[PDB]
């Protein structure tokens, strides 16, 4: 059963992680917005 279990949870961890770098760049863009508002 862990043919599918293992492959699906590896996929989940990968999608997870790439989503978390998406969160990283979300924070980066929020920081960009805040200091461009400060600078303007």
């Amino acid at each position: 059963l862990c043919n599918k279990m293992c492959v699906l949870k590896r996929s989940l961890n990968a999608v997870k992680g790439k989503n978390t770098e998406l969160l990283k760049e979300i924070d980066r863009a929020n920081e960009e917005n805040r200091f461009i508002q400060q600078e303007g």
Binding site: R34, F35, Q38, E39
Partner: protein, 430 residues
């Protein structure tokens, strides 16, 4: 005369004290033997044989770092006493560092404090170095500061605290320890100085252009900034400012005394000395957010008060020119009810570099200690760090079994709530 008692609480405090005493000895020309081959009396005291001993006291409930100092490179320099070590650590437990483990060493700690103060004649104050995120550095530090404030009236306290960094943290109960120790850091510490780790990490990564510093180098930089701020009473200068004279400037209101610090030019030789090191540029680097010793961005908050330690051959005309440029700059916008907002001190003694260090020896250095609205970000993120901790009773039994009341943590959360509330209140425009 004009002496201060150095206190080094915890593992981080002991290592920071090691670094700062290394810097002090190399700067005053005192070899680890303890003798020079009267500006030192603030930090070193003579004996009958002409030997200098530091006026410091090391505490840690576990003996590894204290014994490392004992068997380090200063056996004959450090006193065999005033190097107090417990027998078993608090281990990131505020309850244990305050209630059941530190109580059996606090009495001897105050005994050593008395044995230092009575020797002292013109004691200016106490120079505490610790990290609130650690168990002993929170509990024992808090208890020691309370006892010191009780038995020494309104003597000045300068506590350099390594706060739990935003995301780069080395423990899981650091929010608990910080939110609990914020009490003592409020009532029984006259001035509390930020020591966020990521700020040092980023500035050493970028300005120093060195890939492999460590705790040794961050502690070296902290010792450098401590020496810069405290050298005004150590050496003669144009503007002599002592602990009281700048703490009265940095504390406008009794509760808002937490200060964030920066130091410049912190830089290696290669990029340091291919550019003309003036005063205007170094002040600009001081006020630049990424060249600051605290993980905060002042451009959100508002500067309420600033004090500058110029140390080198700086001249008052250059000082005033830099002050005028900073005032005219728009991004660093001060609070409405503090027009001047600038206090300055000048020293004629240029910085000294220690062998094996990463800093290049610089002709002129500038320290900046500011009380700002922007320092509220650290609390406004620590409270969100801690309410998630406290929502589902995480790591609460380790304190309850060791002697914590359940509601005391909620009371601490309410206290920090009052902290950001009064921060925004004083920062609010009239």
């Amino acid at each position: 005369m004009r002496e201060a008692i150095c206190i080094h609480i915890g593992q981080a405090g002991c290592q920071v004290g090691n670094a700062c005493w290394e810097l002090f000895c190399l700067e005053h020309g005192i070899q680890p033997d303890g003798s020079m081959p009267d500006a030192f009396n603030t930090f070193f005291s003579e004996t009958g044989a002409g030997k200098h001993v530091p006026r410091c006291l090391f505490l840690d409930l576990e003996p590894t770092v204290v014994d490392e100092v004992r068997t380090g490179t200063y056996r004959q320099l450090f006193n065999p006493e005033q190097l107090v070590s417990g027998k078993e650590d608090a281990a990131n437990n505020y309850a244990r560092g305050h209630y059941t483990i530190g109580k059996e060493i606090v009495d001897l700690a105050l005994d050593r404090i008395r044995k230092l103060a009575d020797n002292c004649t013109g004691l200016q104050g106490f120079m505490v170095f610790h990290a609130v995120g650690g168990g002993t550095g929170s509990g024992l530090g808090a208890l020691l500061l309370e006892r010191l404030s009780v038995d020494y009236g309104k003597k000045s306290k300068l506590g350099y605290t390594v706060y739990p960094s935003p995301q780069v943290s080395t423990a899981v109960v650091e929010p608990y320890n910080c939110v609990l120790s914020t009490h003592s850091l409020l009532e029984h510490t006259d001035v509390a100085t930020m020591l966020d780790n990521e700020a040092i990490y980023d500035l050493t990564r970028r300005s120093l252009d060195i890939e492999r510093p460590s705790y040794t180098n961050v502690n070296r930089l902290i010792g450098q900034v401590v020496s810069s701020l405290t050298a005004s009473l150590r050496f003669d200068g144009a503007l002599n400012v002592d602990l009281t004279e700048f703490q009265t400037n940095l504390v406008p209101y009794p509760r808002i005394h937490f200060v964030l610090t920066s130091y410049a030019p912190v830089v290696s030789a290669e990029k340091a000395y291919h550019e003309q090191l003036s005063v205007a540029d170094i002040t600009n680097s001081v006020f630049e957010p990424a060249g600051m010793l605290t993980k905060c961005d002042p451009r959100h908050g508002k500067y309420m008060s600033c004090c500058l330690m110029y140390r080198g051959d700086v001249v008052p005309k250059d000082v005033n020119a830099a002050i005028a440029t900073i005032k005219t700059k728009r991004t660093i916008q001060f609070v409405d009810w503090c027009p001047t907002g600038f206090k300055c001190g000048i020293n004629y003694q240029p910085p000294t570099v220690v062998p094996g260090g990463d800093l290049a020896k610089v002709q002129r250095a500038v320290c900046m200690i500011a009380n700002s609205t922007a320092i509220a970000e650290v609390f406004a993120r620590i409270d969100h760090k801690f309410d998630l901790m406290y929502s589902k009773r995480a790591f609460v039994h380790w304190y309850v079994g060791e002697g914590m009341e359940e509601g005391e943590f909620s009371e601490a959360r309410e206290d920090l709530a009052a902290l950001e509330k009064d921060y925004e209140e004083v920062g609010a425009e009239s």
